[PDB]
Amino acid sequence: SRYQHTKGQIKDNAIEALLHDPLFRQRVEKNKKGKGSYMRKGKHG
Amino acid sequence: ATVNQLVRKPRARKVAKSNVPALEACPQKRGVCTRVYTTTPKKPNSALRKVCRVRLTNGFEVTSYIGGEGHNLQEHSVILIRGGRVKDLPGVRYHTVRGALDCSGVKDRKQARSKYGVKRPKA
Amino acid sequence: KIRTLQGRVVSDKMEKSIVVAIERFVKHPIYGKFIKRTTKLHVHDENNECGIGDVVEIRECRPLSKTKSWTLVRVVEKAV
Amino acid sequence: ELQEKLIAVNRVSKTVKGGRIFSFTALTVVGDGNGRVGFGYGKAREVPAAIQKAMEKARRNMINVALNNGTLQHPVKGVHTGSRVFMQPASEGTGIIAGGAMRAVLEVAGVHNVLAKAYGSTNPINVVRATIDGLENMNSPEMVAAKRGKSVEEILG
Amino acid sequence: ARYLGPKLKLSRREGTDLFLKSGVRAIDTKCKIEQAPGQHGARKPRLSDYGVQLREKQKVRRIYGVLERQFRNYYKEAARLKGNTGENLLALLEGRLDNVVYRMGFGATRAEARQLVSHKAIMVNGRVVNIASYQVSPNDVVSIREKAKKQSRVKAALELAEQREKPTWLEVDAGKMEGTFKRKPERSDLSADINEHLIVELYSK
Amino acid sequence: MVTIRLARHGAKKRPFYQVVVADSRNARNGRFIERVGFFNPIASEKEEGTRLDLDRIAHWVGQGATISDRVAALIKEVNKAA
Amino acid sequence: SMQDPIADMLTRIRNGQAANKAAVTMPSSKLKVAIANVLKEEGFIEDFKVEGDTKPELELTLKYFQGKAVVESIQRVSRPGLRIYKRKDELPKVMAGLGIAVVSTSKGVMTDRAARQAGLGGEIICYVA
RNA sequence: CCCGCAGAAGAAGCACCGGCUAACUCCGUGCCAGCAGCCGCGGUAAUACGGAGGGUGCAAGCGUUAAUCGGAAUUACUGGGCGUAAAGCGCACGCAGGCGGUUUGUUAAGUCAGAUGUGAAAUCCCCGGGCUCAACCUGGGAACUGCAUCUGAUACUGGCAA
RNA sequence: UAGCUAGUAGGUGGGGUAACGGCUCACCUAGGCGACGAUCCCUAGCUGGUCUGAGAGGAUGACCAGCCACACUGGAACUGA
């Protein structure tokens, strides 16, 4: 199925417009433990 | 406070508006469904969520989420719309009833198949 | 005894007729405070035997105009 | 016959130079089941070492309550710091139906069938100080006939 | 309506002999009681304060064999009755017809007496009644029709009740198989271990 | 014309009539002046089959009230010696 | 601006009970003596005296039981912004019978339990708990 | 409705199982597919996805959606607040309004007590009765918090006089 | 939504209705309503009730019954108690 992208009416490049689109934003994950790992309640209980 | 001040302007009841403007308290609405697509969610989730815009039969033009795995909608495919936001996509306040008027049930559910519109398997 | 209401005249000058405010002392439904509310009535009399701003005595009768279904009984405590 | 009981355990922090050091705070309420309550807060580095530290505090902090043999005397209010607790004698109102952390102290109190409601805040540490404020602020016709009327048969009726 | 699944499994969720299977044999230990209601039975539950109220409501339902929408109509009737609600509740359950047939001695279990009521075999006050939820008033007699009298099942179940408590609130002849429901039962008699304290509180939230 | 007629309340296949005084130009269950008894045709061999306030029915006949043929037959059932 | 003199009587009692004062003096009035005669006869106040010739100044000697205030609390109910009139069956009861509620009835000022026995209500005044 | 006939014979689903909230493990998949009421799950050892075994809940129903009230003391009369959290007009004078010190008299308007007329029936509640029981139908009572009238009571409030 | 009102507000007299009446007409007085919300705009059949809530309230008024209203749209009368 289709994808409703950000950049309305992409002209030239058909692949370097989507690279800035939030489909290809940088997925950064969370640490544990690690500079930024506070729980407050974890996955269970 | 001050019971004399409640005689001039009475203690006015707070009005709460409806989350789903689906035309005045009806459970489902049938929709004409132009423009089926996918959209990326808001910040923490990062999936590719399937969602269709829908021309409702009264005049409203709403977008509506399509639950379940795999669908057969295409660019008209007149379907049925129930309420309920998805909290994850911006502007989506509805779901589609899987198993109603064009939107077939999910392939090979075994658990929780009233939702997602799948008949009980004969075998 | 006939049923009858005290009152006080608002305005005289309408020619053998007179308008009377009747103050009724009614409790508010929810809040329980007593509110001084007013019932204005067009009241029939003869020509000018009562004036503006004075206590009055009124009884209910047959209609006499598009309003003015009440009638003077007597005039107590005339306008000073 | 001592009937010790737990209500809530919480994890608190201290946040020191290296990381942060956690510790656990219990909240227990004991009571004989007849007119006596008592609560102790208790806290330690580890969870079971906090609760038995909280039980021993609850035994030495007991309050006497005079009750009508299964219930309260009169509708008493219990304000303490967040908690506008109302609790009503409910003359065989059939069952301790009170809110969370307020149901806990009252079932070990000895009362069986009162009504109640917590207003305002609902912090378990405060609402259990709130109802034990109310059960101390309640007085019996054995006591109010020592001040006013001076006759238990004339004070009540 | 009825449960009719495995019924000695319903005991192990309580750990309590709910007298469901028990019947002809004596003391069972034939299910690993107190131990394993399923796959994860050997684990101990924390059983929060909602769980101690629900598992006491389900126990009183699974004893008398009453579903929820009917058990909620007993409670809604027990609240409007004069007096104690948890004692009005057990009086309505103990006064059911299939309960009275069980208490007289007719039927080894309660589900047997439910079938023995349902199949037109129980004659209460000179009339035949299908409904196991028939509410037996005090000073009523209740017996067996001779079409189903001494039919090899009521005979065995009657002698089996000689080893039981022999309840106070009813007399039964058991040779003529006609027992008189004397009075409504009192809470001091009936079993003293079901905690109706909790059932009144669960419907209030 | 006022009339003393029945009303047909009750359930399905279990009729229960309210002998009642009403204007003629109203419905059977419609606006009535005063209820003046009841009639249970399927009652039992029991205590009560029919009450009928005859002091009001004599009062309304004295005003000139007609009586429908069932209600007139029920006065022939609640007789001076029956 | 001296709107309710009767609530001024009651707030001098709580502030007397709180401050452990021996006695509390106030301007006297006809209605003050009626309410204080109730509290004397009911057991909340010892020995009111109304010593005053042209400026009548009544004093209420307060009552203390252990080292403790006898009056638990006393709330002016029918304050002059909101008059509260009660019917016979509608008459309240404070602390489920063991407090009292001073009501002003057609046969004078009396307690709630005396106005049930008389069988007539009126303007309740205070809730002496 | 009753009797007789045969044959355990024709008759059990739906939701849920991380926390709230009763009920858990294995496998598959790897911020993908998906879930979701809120907080949030999924990045290779997912009790949260999907399937499986097990369990819990309700049961000829079970869930979703919608609407309403409830919880919500979250418009607070009952029953909230306003130094700093949302909130004291920048400060005054002041009409209408609201409130009003103290004693005697009279008035009885508000108030209170009683009576009478009415407040349709059904409904709701109580005690009973009838369908095998229940739902249902029904008898009697209470209620319908009210309004009008008359008879009093006079503490308090209002009027009027000192 | 701040002022609306000219048969409008009242009077006298004729007429009209089963009946009082600006209901109507001629003449005279210039009033009448309005911050206790007239006027205008939006919405809506009304009540007993129903649902909820411990209550006070809040929401609603399907079935059942009482009242009103309308009968393709707009208007008019005739007959008739």
Per CATH, which fold does E94-181 belong to?
3.10.290
Q: Where are the domains of chain F?
A: 1-81
Residue with tokens 């004596």: E26
Say yes or no: Cβ of E51 under 7 A from any atom of strand H: yes
Element (H, E) at D104: helix D103-109
Provide the CB-side half-sphere exposure for E202 (13 A, CA).
20
Q: Do D157 and G44 touch (CB under 8 A)?
A: no
Q: Looking at chain A, which residue has its C-alpha nearest residue B35?
A: A2
Min CA distance, G6 vs chain C (Å)? 19
Nearest alpha carbon to residue D58 among D95, D20, D96, D32? D32
- DSSP class per residue in F5-73: E---EEETTEEEB--EEEETTS-SSS-EEEE-EEE-TT--SSS-SEEE-HHHHHHHHHHT-EE-HHHHH
Query: For chain F, which chains pass the contact test of at least 3 CB pairs under 8 Å?
Result: none
Q: Looking at chain B, which residue has its C-alpha nearest residue G79?
A: B3
Q: Do G98 and D141 touch (CB under 8 A)?
A: yes
DSSP assigned state of A41: S
Strand I, CB < 7 A, residues 11-50 of C: 11, 13-17, 19, 23, 29-30, 36-38, 40, 42, 44
Nearest alpha carbon to residue F65 among F29, F20, F26? F20
Amino acid identity of residue D59, one-letter, is R
Which of A4, A22, A27 minimises the CB distance to B38?
A4
Residue E126: CB partners within 8 Å, gap ≥ 6? E141
Question: For chain E, how many residues are written?
Answer: 205
What does the block give as tokens for D104? 């806990």
Tell me the resolution in Å: 3.1
Cα E43–E48–E50 angle (5° rounding)?
130
Q: What whole-number distance in Å separates Cα of residue D89 and Cα of residue D98?
A: 12
Cα F62–F64–F68 angle (5° rounding)?
110
C-alpha distance from residue D53 to each of D27, D58, D60, D61, E59 (Å): 10, 9, 12, 13, 36
H33 C1' to B114 CA distance, Å: 20
Q: What whole-number distance in Å separates Cα of residue E75 and Cα of residue E59?
A: 15
Residue with tokens 């939702």: B115
Determination technique used: cryo-EM
C-alpha distance from residue F30 to each of C19, C37, F4, G22 (Å): 45, 41, 13, 76
CATH class of E7-93+190-203: mainly alpha
Nucleotides of I under 7 A from a protein CB: 8-12, 20-23, 29-34, 36, 56-59, 64-67
Residue with tokens 């001024």: G8
Q: What whole-number distance in Å separates Cα of residue G127 and Cα of residue G38?
A: 12
What does the block give as tokens for E85? 């609600």
Instruction: Output b/e per residue, D101-140; b: 16+ Cβ within 10 A.
Output: bbbbbbbbbbbbbbbbebbeebbbbbbbbbbbbbbeebbb
Say yes or no: Cβ of F49 under 7 A from any atom of strand H: no
Cα E190–E192–E197 angle (5° rounding)?
110
Nearest alpha carbon to residue B26 among B65, B57, B61, B67? B57
Strands F66-67 and F2-5 turn out to be parallel
Which chain B residues have a beta carbon less than 8 Å from that of C35? 7
Residue contacts between B and G (CB atoms, under 8 Å): 3
Residues of B near G (Cβ–Cβ under 8 Å) read 3-4
What does the block give as tokens for E198? 């909790």
Q: What whole-number distance in Å separates Cα of residue D3 and Cα of residue D29?
A: 9
I56 C1' to E122 CA distance, Å: 52
Q: Where are the domains of chain E?
A: 7-93+190-203, 94-181
Nearest alpha carbon to residue C6 among C20, C27, C17, C26? C20
Q: Chain C within 8 Å of B6 (Cβ-Cβ)? A: yes
Amino acid identity of residue B19, one-letter, is N
Q: What whole-number distance in Å separates Cα of residue D106 and Cα of residue D5?
A: 11
Cβ atoms within 10 Å of A40's Cβ, excluding its own: 6
Q: Looking at chain B, which residue has its C-alpha nearest residue A3?
A: B38
Residue C45 Rama label (left phi>0; alpha psi -120 to 50; beta): beta
Restricting to C residues 3-42, those with a Cβ less than 8 Å away from any Cβ of B are 28, 31-33, 35
Q: What whole-number distance in Å separates Cα of residue C3 and Cα of residue D76?
A: 51
3-class secondary-structure state, position G75: strand
What does the block give as tokens for F22? 């009403």
Say yes or no: Cβ of B13 under 7 A from any atom of strand I: yes
Q: Looking at chain A, which residue has its C-alpha nearest residue B73?
A: A1
Q: What whole-number distance in Å separates Cα of residue D32 and Cα of residue A25?
A: 63
Min CA distance, B38 vs chain A (Å)? 5
Nearest alpha carbon to residue G45 among G76, G10, G91? G10
Cβ atoms within 10 Å of E67's Cβ, excluding its own: 11
Nucleotides of H under 7 A from a protein CB: 2-4, 12-25, 31-43, 47-48, 50-60, 62-68, 72-77, 80-82, 97-104, 109-114, 120-121, 125-127, 129-134, 136-140, 148-150, 152-157
Cβ atoms within 10 Å of A14's Cβ, excluding its own: 8
Residue contacts between C and G (CB atoms, under 8 Å): 5
Domains observed in chain G = 1-71 (3.30.1370.30), 72-129 (3.30.1490.10)
Which chain B residues have a beta carbon less than 8 Å from that of G81? 3-4
3-class secondary-structure state, position B61: strand
CATH architecture for segment(s) B1-123? Beta Barrel (2.40)
What does the block give as tokens for E114? 């439910």
Min CA distance, D28 vs chain G (Å)? 30
Q: Chain D within 8 Å of G2 (Cβ-Cβ)? A: no
Nearest alpha carbon to residue C58 among C9, C18, C20, C4? C4
3-class secondary-structure state, position E60: helix
H119 C1' to C3 CA distance, Å: 21
3-class secondary-structure state, position C11: strand
Cβ atoms within 10 Å of E91's Cβ, excluding its own: 21
Residue D11: CB partners within 8 Å, gap ≥ 6? D22, D23, D24, D25
DSSP assigned state of E40: T
Strand partners, C58: C5, C72
Which chain G residues have a beta carbon less than 8 Å from that of C34? 83
